[PDB]
Design a protein around this ligand. Structure first.
Ligand SMILES: [Mg+2]
Ligand SMILES: [Mg+2]
Ligand SMILES: [Mg+2]
Ligand SMILES: [Mg+2]
Ligand SMILES: [Mg+2]
Ligand SMILES: [Mg+2]
Ligand SMILES: [Mg+2]
Ligand SMILES: [Mg+2]
Ligand SMILES: [Mg+2]
Ligand SMILES: [Mg+2]
Ligand SMILES: [Mg+2]
Ligand SMILES: [Mg+2]
Ligand SMILES: [Mg+2]
Ligand SMILES: [Mg+2]
Ligand SMILES: [Mg+2]
Ligand SMILES: [Mg+2]
Ligand SMILES: [Mg+2]
Ligand SMILES: [Mg+2]
Ligand SMILES: [Mg+2]
Ligand SMILES: [Mg+2]
Ligand SMILES: [Mg+2]
Ligand SMILES: [Mg+2]
Ligand SMILES: [Mg+2]
Ligand SMILES: [Mg+2]
Ligand SMILES: [Mg+2]
Ligand SMILES: [Mg+2]
Ligand SMILES: [Mg+2]
Ligand SMILES: [Mg+2]
Ligand SMILES: [Mg+2]
Ligand SMILES: [Mg+2]
Ligand SMILES: [Mg+2]
Ligand SMILES: [Mg+2]
Ligand SMILES: [Mg+2]
Ligand SMILES: [Mg+2]
Ligand SMILES: [Mg+2]
Ligand SMILES: [Mg+2]
Ligand SMILES: [Mg+2]
Ligand SMILES: [Mg+2]
Ligand SMILES: [Mg+2]
Ligand SMILES: [Mg+2]
Ligand SMILES: [Mg+2]
Ligand SMILES: [Mg+2]
Lengths: 150, 138, 234
RNA sequence: CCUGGUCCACCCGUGACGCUGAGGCGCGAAAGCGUGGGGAGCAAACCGGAUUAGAUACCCGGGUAGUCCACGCCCUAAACGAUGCGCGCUAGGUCUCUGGGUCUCCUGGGGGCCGAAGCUAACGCGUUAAGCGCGCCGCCUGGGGAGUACGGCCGCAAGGC
RNA sequence: CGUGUAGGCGGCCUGGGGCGUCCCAUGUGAAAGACCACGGCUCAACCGUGGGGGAGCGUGGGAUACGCUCAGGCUAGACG
C-alpha cells in the first residue's frame, strides 16, 4: 500500500442492438515517496472496480526513481507516440512545475523540485505512460561510468 | 557520395550499436579517429584499429555494450544511448568558450574541434577555448 | 564419454529455415542441413548444467515441457523419474502467468479424485456419472504433470523453445530462469541456459534430457541406470 | 535501316572532373483547336423505340465531330507508389527476369511477396524504407468563400499558369 | 517528367597564408531604466549612494582542429 492517487477516470462506451453498453477506465498512480511509483490503468463495469484494478495493476508495475537531493538526476526528453515530454531538474526549494499528470506521478515519485512540460498530444493516458518511460530512463554519475568500466 | 563523413561515422556507429555488433568499419580519416580517440579516451567503445579492405583503409571500431538483462527484451542496455552531430555542413555551429554545452547535466560529453586540438565539453572548457561544436554523445 | 555420444547422431538439424541470431551456434551447411558446432555446444551444456546442479542441490523445483510428438513420451518419463513437474499435452495459456487461476482446476481434479472413491456413487444420475467421469478424463488428461508443487518453478527446461515460445514468454514476464534444448530453428537471446542441438530426432532429445535428470538426481543421492528409452526407438 | 538509355566482365585511361537545382529550355495520356488528307468499326450531340409518374438517362435501332495520318497549337489529369533527387548505414526467407564464373554453388542488375531492429495516430513500411543519417530543390499552416475575383503572362479558342 | 544556369552543399593525404572561427589585452558601450546592497521621507510608492553585469563594433598580440584559399599528390566518388 502506497499513496495511490488516480490520474483520471472515464466512461467509455460500446454499441449493440437495443443500445450502448458502458465500462469505466481508471488510471492510477501509486508511489511510496522514496523513489517508487507505479502506473496502472484499470477498466471494468464500475468506477470502484476500475479504481481498485488500477491500483492492483499498478503495484504490479513500478519503477525505482533514482532521486537525488529531491530532484531528478538529469534532463530528459521522451517521445511516446503522439505525446512528448521534457523533464529538467531544478535547484532545491523550486517546486514541482508540471501539469496534473507528470505531477501526480512525480509527486509520489519522491521529487520535490523538477521543471517540466507536455509536448505534442497532451492526452493523459499517453503522457502518463510517457512520464514513466521518462523516469525509467534516468541515470546517476555512478551507474553511468558503472557502464564505461573497461 | 557522403557529404559529411563525420555525421556518417556516428550514424554507422549509431546503427551497429542499435543491433549489438562486435565492431564496425568507418572509412579512414585522421580527423575521424580524433572523435574516436576521444570517444574511447572517455570510455564509450572498447576501442579501434586501422585495417584495409583491398587498398581501402577503414577503421575497426569495437563497440561496448552493457550486461544481459532480466525479463522480456533481455537486450543489454548500451553505453551510447545517443549520439547526434551538431555542427553540420549545411549550418556550421561555432561556440565561444562561455557557450560550450553542458551535455546530459554533466553525465554527457560534447566533442568539438578547436584551434588547439580536439577537446571535450570539459577539456576545452578547462583549456578555456572554443571552436566548431562538432557534436555530443551520452 | 560426452562427445562420442553426440557425435553419434545428435546434432545438425533444421535446414535453410533458420534464424540468423543462432548463427553463433553452427559449424556449416552440409548437403543442405545446418551442422551445429558441437564444440561450442559442449561449452554451453556446461554453464547450463552448472546452473541446474547449482540448483538441484538447493531444493529447487524445475518444470519441463515438450508438446511435440517427436519428443512427448520421453519428457513424460524423465519428469516422473525425477519428481519434477512437466507438460506433455496442451500447454495451457497463462499457466505460470495465471497460475492461481489454473491451479483452480488442479484443485477441481482432486475434487473429483476424491468423489471417485465414495458411497455417494450409489446415487447421482447417469447424466453426471458420464459428465464428471468425462470431465475428469480430460481434467486428468492435462494436469498429469502440472500439479506436484503448488508454487511457481525456479526455472523451466524445454525442447523446441520457439515451438513453445508462449510458455517461455509467460516465464520471462514473471522472471523465471529459462533453460532449453534449442536447435537452429530458434532464437537464443530470449533463452537463458541454451542447449544447442536437434529438437526433433528423439535420438538427441532423449540423451540431452536424460543426462539432465540424472544430474538432477546426482544432487539428491541414488545414482542408477538409465530410464526406458528404447521401445521402438528406430 | 536510324538512334537513346541501361546491365555484366576485364583493372586499361582521367584524377574529385561531384550531388542538387530558382529562373530558363525540352517532353508531356485523353479530350479540344488550325491547314490538308482519310473514314471500316465505334461514337458525345442528335432522332426514333421502349422503361417510367416524368426519363432531357440506364436498354434497343440509327447517327456526326471525333477516334487515323502529316504538319502546327493547346499543356491539363486519380500526370498515383496519391511516396523529390543523390549517397551512406541497418537480419533473413521466398519466386522471378536478366548478366558473369575453376557453374548442387558463388557474385552483379531489376521486378514481387513475407518479414529483423527500428518507424507509425493507426493502417502499414520494412536494403525497391515510410528505419538511422547528410546535401539541395519543391511545397503545407482549420472548413466554406475559391483555385473564384482582380492584375499580369501565355493561347486562334476552349482555357492555362 | 527531364535537361541544366545562378546559387547551396563537397573524398583522401602533405605543406604555405590565416578571411571565417577561437583566446588574451585595450578603447567603446552617456545618464535614466533593469539586477545587488545600503541608506532618506514613520513604511511604502517615489528617491540618493556605491557595486555588478552589456551584447555588439574598433585597434594591438596570438592559435590553426574545422570551413576558406593557394600549392603538390592519390584513387574508394564520377567519367572513359
Ligand atoms: Mg443480437
Ligand atoms: Mg537504476
Ligand atoms: Mg506505441
Ligand atoms: Mg511523433
Ligand atoms: Mg495537438
Ligand atoms: Mg546501345
Ligand atoms: Mg586504373
Ligand atoms: Mg598519375
Ligand atoms: Mg498533349
Ligand atoms: Mg486527341
Ligand atoms: Mg468544337
Ligand atoms: Mg453505331
Ligand atoms: Mg447508340
Ligand atoms: Mg417516351
Ligand atoms: Mg418509377
Ligand atoms: Mg496528327
Ligand atoms: Mg510547349
Ligand atoms: Mg484532377
Ligand atoms: Mg498508380
Ligand atoms: Mg533484389
Ligand atoms: Mg513490373
Ligand atoms: Mg517488431
Ligand atoms: Mg511488410
Ligand atoms: Mg545493403
Ligand atoms: Mg530482401
Ligand atoms: Mg512518413
Ligand atoms: Mg527536386
Ligand atoms: Mg478563416
Ligand atoms: Mg478560409
Ligand atoms: Mg486575368
Ligand atoms: Mg489574346
Ligand atoms: Mg478554333
Ligand atoms: Mg539535374
Ligand atoms: Mg556553385
Ligand atoms: Mg582572421
Ligand atoms: Mg564573431
Ligand atoms: Mg569592457
Ligand atoms: Mg547604464
Ligand atoms: Mg529606510
Ligand atoms: Mg546607480
Ligand atoms: Mg565579453
Ligand atoms: Mg587537389
Amino acid at each position: 500500500d502506497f499513496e495511490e492517487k488516480m490520474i483520471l477516470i472515464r466512461r467509455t462506451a460500446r454499441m449493440q442492438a437495443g443500445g450502448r453498453r458502458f465500462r469505466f477506465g481508471a488510471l492510477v498512480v501509486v508511489g511510496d515517496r522514496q523513489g517508487r511509483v507505479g502506473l496502472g490503468f484499470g477498466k471494468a463495469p464500475e468506477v470502484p472496480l476500475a479504481v481498485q484494478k488500477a491500483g492492483y495493476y499498478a503495484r504490479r508495475n513500478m519503477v525505482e526513481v533514482p532521486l537525488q537531493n529531491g530532484t531528478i538526476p538529469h534532463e530528459i526528453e521522451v517521445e511516446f507516440g503522439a505525446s512528448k515530454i521534457v523533464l529538467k531538474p531544478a535547484a532545491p526549494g523550486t517546486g514541482v512545475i508540471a501539469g496534473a499528470v507528470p505531477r501526480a506521478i512525480l509527486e509520489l515519485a519522491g521529487v520535490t523540485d523538477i521543471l517540466t512540460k507536455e509536448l505534442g498530444s497532451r492526452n493523459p493516458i499517453n503522457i502518463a505512460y510517457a512520464t514513466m518511460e521518462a523516469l525509467r530512463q534516468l541515470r546517476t554519475k555512478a551507474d553511468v561510468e558503472r557502464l564505461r568500466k573497461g | 557520395m557522403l557529404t559529411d563523413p563525420i555525421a556518417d561515422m556516428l550514424t554507422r556507429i549509431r546503427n551497429a550499436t542499435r543491433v549489438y555488433k562486435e565492431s564496425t568499419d568507418v572509412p579512414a580519416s585522421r580527423f575521424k579517429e580524433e572523435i574516436l580517440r576521444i570517444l574511447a579516451r572517455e570510455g564509450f567503445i572498447k576501442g579501434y584499429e586501422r585495417v584495409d579492405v583491398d587498398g581501402k583503409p577503414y577503421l575497426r571500431v569495437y563497440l561496448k555494450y552493457g550486461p544481459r538483462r532480466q525479463g522480456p527484451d533481455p537486450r543489454p542496455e548500451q553505453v551510447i544511448h545517443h549520439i547526434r552531430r551538431i555542427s553540420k555542413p549545411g549550418r556550421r555551429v561555432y561556440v565561444g568558450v562561455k557557450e560550450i554545452p553542458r551535455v546530459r547535466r554533466g553525465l554527457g560529453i560534447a566533442i568539438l574541434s578547436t584551434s588547439k586540438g580536439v577537446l571535450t565539453d570539459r577539456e576545452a572548457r578547462k583549456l578555456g577555448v572554443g571552436g566548431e561544436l562538432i557534436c555530443e554523445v551520452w | 564419454v560426452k562427445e562420442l555420444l553426440e557425435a553419434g547422431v545428435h546434432f545438425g538439424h533444421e535446414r535453410k529455415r533458420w534464424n540468423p541470431k543462432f548463427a553463433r551456434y553452427i559449424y556449416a551447411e552440409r548437403n543442405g542441413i545446418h551442422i551445429i558446432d558441437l564444440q561450442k555446444t559442449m561449452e554451453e551444456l556446461e554453464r547450463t548444467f552448472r546452473f541446474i546442479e547449482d540448483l538441484a542441490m538447493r531444493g529447487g523445483t524445475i518444470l519441463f515441457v515438450g508438446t511435440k510428438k517427436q519428443a512427448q513420451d520421453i519428457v513424460r518419463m524423465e519428469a516422473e523419474r525425477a519428481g519434477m513437474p512437466y507438460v506433455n499435452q496442451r500447454w495451457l495459456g497463462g499457466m505460470l502467468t495465471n497460475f492461481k487461476t489454473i491451479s483452480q482446476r488442479v484443485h477441481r481434479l482432486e475434487e473429483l479424485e476424491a468423489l471417485f472413491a465414495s458411497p455417494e456413487i450409489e446415487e447421482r444420475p447417469k447424466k453426471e456419472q458420464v459428465r464428471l467421469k468425462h470431465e475428469l478424463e480430460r481434467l486428468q488428461k492435462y494436469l498429469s504433470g502440472f500439479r506436484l508443487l503448488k508454487r511457481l518453478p525456479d526455472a523451466i527446461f524445454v525442447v523446441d523453445p520457439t515451438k513453445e515460445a508462449i510458455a517461455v514468454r509467460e516465464a520471462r514476464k514473471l522472471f523465471i530462469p529459462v533453460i532449453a534444448l534449442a536447435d537452429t530453428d530458434s532464437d537464443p537471446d530470449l533463452v537463458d541456459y541454451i542447449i544447442p542441438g536437434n529438437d526433433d530426432a528423439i535420438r538427441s532429445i532423449q540423451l540431452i534430457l536424460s543426462r539432465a535428470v540424472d544430474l538432477i538426481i546426482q544432487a539428491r543421492g541414488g545414482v542408477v541406470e538409465p530410464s526406458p528409452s528404447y521401445a521402438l526407438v528406430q
